[PDB]
Amino acid sequence: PGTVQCFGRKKTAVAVAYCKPGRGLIKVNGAPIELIRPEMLRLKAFEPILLAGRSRFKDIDMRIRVRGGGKTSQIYSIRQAIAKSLVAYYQKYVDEAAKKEVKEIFARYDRTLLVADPRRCEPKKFGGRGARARFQKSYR
Amino acid sequence: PGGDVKLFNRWTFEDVQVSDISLNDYLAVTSMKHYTFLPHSAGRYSAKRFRKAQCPIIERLTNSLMMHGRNNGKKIMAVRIIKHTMEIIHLLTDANPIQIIVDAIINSGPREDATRIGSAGVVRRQAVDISPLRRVNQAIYLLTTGARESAFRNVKTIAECLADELINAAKGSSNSYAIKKKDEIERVAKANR
Amino acid sequence: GKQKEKVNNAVLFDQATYDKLLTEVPKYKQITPSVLSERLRINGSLARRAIKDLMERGLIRMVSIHSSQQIFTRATN
Amino acid sequence: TVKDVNPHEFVKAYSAHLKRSGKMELPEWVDIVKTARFKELPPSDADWYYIRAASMARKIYLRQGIGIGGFQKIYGGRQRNGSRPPHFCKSSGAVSRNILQELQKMGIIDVDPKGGRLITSQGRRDLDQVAGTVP
Amino acid sequence: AGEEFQHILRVLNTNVDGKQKIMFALTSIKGVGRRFSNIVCKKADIDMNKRAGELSAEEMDRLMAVVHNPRQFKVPDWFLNRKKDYKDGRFSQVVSNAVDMKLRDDLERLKKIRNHRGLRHYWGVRVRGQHTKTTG
Amino acid sequence: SRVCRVCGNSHGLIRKYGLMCCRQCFRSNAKDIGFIKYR
Amino acid sequence: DTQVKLAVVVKVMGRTGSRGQVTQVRVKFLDDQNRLIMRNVKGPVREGDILTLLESEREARRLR
Amino acid sequence: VQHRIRITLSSKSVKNLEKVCSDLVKGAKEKQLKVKGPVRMPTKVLNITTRKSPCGEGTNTWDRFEMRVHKRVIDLVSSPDVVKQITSITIEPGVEVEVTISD
RNA sequence: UUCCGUUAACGAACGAGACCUCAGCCUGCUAACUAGCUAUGCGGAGCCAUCCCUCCGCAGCUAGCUUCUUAGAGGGACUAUGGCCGUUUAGGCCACGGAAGUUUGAGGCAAUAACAGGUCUGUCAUGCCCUUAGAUGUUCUGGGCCGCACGCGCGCUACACUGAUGUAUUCAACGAGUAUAUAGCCUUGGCCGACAGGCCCGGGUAAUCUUGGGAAAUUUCAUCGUGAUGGGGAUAGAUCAUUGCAAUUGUUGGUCUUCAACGAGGAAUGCCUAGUAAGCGCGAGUCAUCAGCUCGCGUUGACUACGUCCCUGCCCUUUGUACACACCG
Ligand SMILES: [Mg+2]
Ligand SMILES: [Mg+2]
Ligand SMILES: [Mg+2]
Ligand SMILES: [Mg+2]
Ligand SMILES: [Mg+2]
Ligand SMILES: [Mg+2]
Ligand SMILES: [Mg+2]
Ligand SMILES: [Mg+2]
Ligand SMILES: [Mg+2]
Ligand SMILES: [Mg+2]
Ligand SMILES: [Mg+2]
Ligand SMILES: [Mg+2]
Ligand SMILES: [Zn+2]
Secondary structure (H helix, E strand, O other), rough: OOEEEEEEOOOOOOEEEEEEEEOOOOOOEEEEEEHHOOOOOOOHHHHHHHHHHHOOOOEEEEEEEEEEOHHHHHHEEEEEEEEHHHHHHHHHHHHHHHHHHHHHHHHHHHOOOOOOOOOOOOOOOOOOOOOOOOOOOOOO | OOOOOEEEEOEEEOOOOOOOOOOOOOOOOOOOOOOOOOOOOOOOOOOOOOHHOOOOOHHHHHHHHHHOOOOOOOOHHHHHHHHHHHHHHHHHHHHHHHHHHHHHHHOOOOOOOOOOOOOOOOOOOEEEEEEEHHHHHHHHHHHHHHHHHHHHHOOOOOHEEEEEEEEHHHHEEHHHHHEHHHHHHHHHHHOOH | OOOHHHHHHOHHHHHHHHOOOOOHHHOOOOOOOHHHHHHOOOOOOOOOOHHHHHHOOOOOOOOOOOOOOOOOOOOOO | OOOOOOOHHHHHHHHHHHOOOOOOOOOOOOOOOHHHHHOOOOOOOHHHHHHHHHHHHHHHOOOOOOHHHHHHHHHHHEOOOOOOEEEEOOOOOHHHHHHHHHHHHHEEEEEEEOOOEEEEEEHHHHHHHHOOOOO | OOOOOEEEHHHOOOOOOOOOEHHHHHHHHOOOOOOHHHHHHHHOOOOOOOOOOOOOHHHHHHHHHHHHHHHHHOOOOOOOOOOOOOOOOOOOOOOOHHHHHHHHHHHHHHHHOOOHHHHHHHOOOOOOOOOOOOOO | OOOOOOOOOOEEEHHHHHOOHHHHHHHHHHHHHHOOOOO | OOOOEEEEEEEOOOOOOOOOEEEEEEEEEEEOOOOOOEEEEEEEOOOOOOOOOOOOOOOOOOOO | OEEEEEEEEEOOOOOHHHHHHHHHHHHHHOOOOOOEEEEEEEEEEEEEEEEEOOOOOOOOOOEEEEEEEEEEEEEEEEEEEEEEHOOOOOOOOOOEEEEOOOO
16 A cells, blocks of 8 residues: 655755655656766765665655756755655655664764755845845945 | 765775864764765754864865855855866875875964954954864865965866865975965964964 | 967877877876876877877777866876 | 666767668758857857757657747857846747758657647657667 | 978968967958858868868968858858948958958048048047946 | 826836826825735 | 974853954863963864964963 | 536635635535635735835835735536525625636 | 843833734645646557556546645744753753744834935925016927046946856746737747748636746856967947837847957955855836846855954943034034
């Protein structure tokens, strides 16, 4: 009865990973994750995958989809949604205690894999272009 | 300890050993926690004080790389330059290029400086000591400025300018902008001692 | 140096980088980038980036090309 | 297949593909133009027209209903206006058109009901197998 | 490989530097921009990866031909820089010193005609409707 | 050839949404037309 | 030949300077753990930091 | 027999709109209609920025107005005689109702 | 002037805080074919092919569908727990936990007394005064506000290689769209066109059509190789087109050509403490056409600092005053 659909979120980039209990497929938008294309930030999207190992993926297919945001925002949503779909799937279908090792490895590496970042772009105030800047001021 | 984590999956952090027990706190190279695969992270640093002594040394330098306006706001180019530099450090010395980075950060840090103190009612400058965290701050800033003005209007590229400066600084020679400015700040403070 | 104006002064297309110079320019560290010796062999580029297209098929070194066209070097193996 | 491969080498394979897989017609202004108003020089590529075709071929591969104007829009770019601030400028459309009539006369694509250009069932075959023949 | 490498060429008496692409060396000629240089090199059918100076004399001759009879190459009326002239009306690519000549032609026309544009040139201040309090 | 519905002045109109008022008449009748100023 | 000595910032006595730029601290020598000497440091410092100290004699005085 | 009718409803006030829609909805449930809604539609936020000075000096200070318009729809599977059997009850202030006969 | 408290004071009013909005969290609730997964059915293409496995398109009495999207009602955070400091008061610093521990962020509103602050050039708001036909009224034609020895202010573009040009690759949010007449504001698709821009059949009064906004910067592949160079794009010549009844003192946009000064900038000076500066484009106002501006929106995204009264000021207390239009006395 395995079926999860778990997400992750960044500035505006929202990423949703829906899973089957297949064998080894992990794609992004139909394209393999092996090709994610900030091609220096191709380590980041793999970080959950390499922290856990494929052995924790030999029974799942992740057709993860990402919409909105920017570019690095999307990388940072994919990381989050892979991590959060993994922990949701283990917690509901492997075991709570067996999921504990996964969360403690991830939160050991960092905490931002699993928990979204509350930071957003804050509105710009009249009297100067900039959220916190102002026009240059002249006295004479 | 357990460290199957190599930045860019080729450059092993294990066997990293900083002589300065002063900066063993302020360099993020030793304990299991500061290791990351890539010097780019969406960190919520700067929210609280001293939080940056925990930022990875390579990421923290990468942040110092993206400077002078045309180059503010592009960390991807910065990590790219770090990779090319970081490769060619190995491609010259055949030792842990991380050791080269960290030993250069150590060796390019002033130990005494001159502030503008006054006492008992009158002010005129006096020399003081350097807290190790601003030691490290200024080493990062000053190595990076050395590389940048070595690369300005020069066909030679930034990755390799920065590699040249890290290699000869961690060597300890007085061929780096970084160590030259270090030594002059130190001798001015020694003057105003 | 004047290293693409000079691309045609026939010593370059005769012996200069026909393992006369960058047989030894590697020898310092045995693996010393073309881009990095753009100034250790002070000579600049595109008479130097053509020669490494030359010397890969002249079969004398290993190569990495990436973002900045950032090419590299290795002496003999 | 096509999604399974690096987004560049597919275009590098396919550019030589519709060079050597037979041939076709090609209007006799291909060599002068800038292909977009904001550009500055004609493309450095000698076989730039085929790479144009390959890229637009995978655009139509993985989307339906892309127009004469949508192809302009997806190929436009940044226009530095001189001392003025730069902006977005759409590319030129008559370059995209004859690419579409080439792929149409090759049957790689064809005009869509509801508007646009949709991949042809056999053009799908062509692109999928040429992508399968990549590392 | 420059067995006979010529460092300055004297093409059309403008001192083409012999160390640049035939592409971006003809730009020195007054009337040959980057674009018209590129199209001249194409329609003279020349190997482009070639420093002008390693290039041969037949090729210099063809460059001559394509720039003194361009319209015969089907090259459109709209690269040329004297479109719909009013002396004659022919479409021409005016050349190194002919450009100076033609510029003086237009200016003297306007000077005689008493144009606002022409007297504006004759006074020296800016000619294109521009504010002039704070610039020029 | 366009003035306020209010004061018949041809400077500083707000033509968007068809207000056809000047920027000052719109502030003067602002909150009763319904531009409740949460911010 | 003065050899640099390391000391630990046991407690920060204050933040002195005309402009408020210098922290004024107590350093406890690692080498002989009974030498508490009081110094001026520049930059952010918190308790327990090991500090590189070129000269030993130069000390601050309370509100220097 | 039983046709397909839609009710298009919008206003300026959250509370008042939420009261009207619930009135229609419970009206539908009393007569056991095949009712589907009330689907909520994204709120259109008219905005204006105006320099709040009337003469133009001092610090350049603007004020922003915003009218929010809230869009709602309900689908009813009924005959229009039943529709006017129902939708004659009190309509609360400010809310606007524009029933439409669909395909 | 927030409180504890002291207390010739007692008790009260505004201001602060409270209040409102946007943003951050919820796999909890109400729903949603104008939004959208998910599964199945077929349909295309690849493939140990015969079935399957993968990417795609189409429709549904598929949902014991609502994660994604929208927006309603709620919930949540209070420094609650712990530690140390504290009259163990008001509180403060630290630590787990949590999305959130500068009041969580940002704004909106914002007191008495004023200033001879700005506006009669916003008003059929307005006293007094001037004008009232040969008019400072109103209308029309043209010029003018735009004229340039020169000084100043906010900005735009750059001085390159951490780059320029040329392919390829692909990701937002704000918002906006009058009968606009014989398709008409936003404009899809098709054709003509190198470009500008044209002709055709359309869609939308809008989560329906534009636009699920295919934005740039950035990302790879080459090309330039330190050179006032292909950086830089002012200046001007020639021509076409669109808007407009009308483009001249070039409306604007193209094409080709001209390739100007600018080598990181003197004394001095501006803003800025985290999605912030900086970099990047987009929308809106203005608009028949003109956005280097102003107001909003997102994208990439940091150095330093967590302090002080040194400078420039504000608040309170003591203090001195020959000042009170108040030290610009
Ligand atoms: Mg460089
Ligand atoms: Mg607040
Ligand atoms: Mg004026
Ligand atoms: Mg201003
Ligand atoms: Mg580019
Ligand atoms: Mg240029
Ligand atoms: Mg100031
Ligand atoms: Mg506009
Ligand atoms: Mg006295
Ligand atoms: Mg006295
Ligand atoms: Mg007096
Ligand atoms: Mg005085
Ligand atoms: Zn008005």
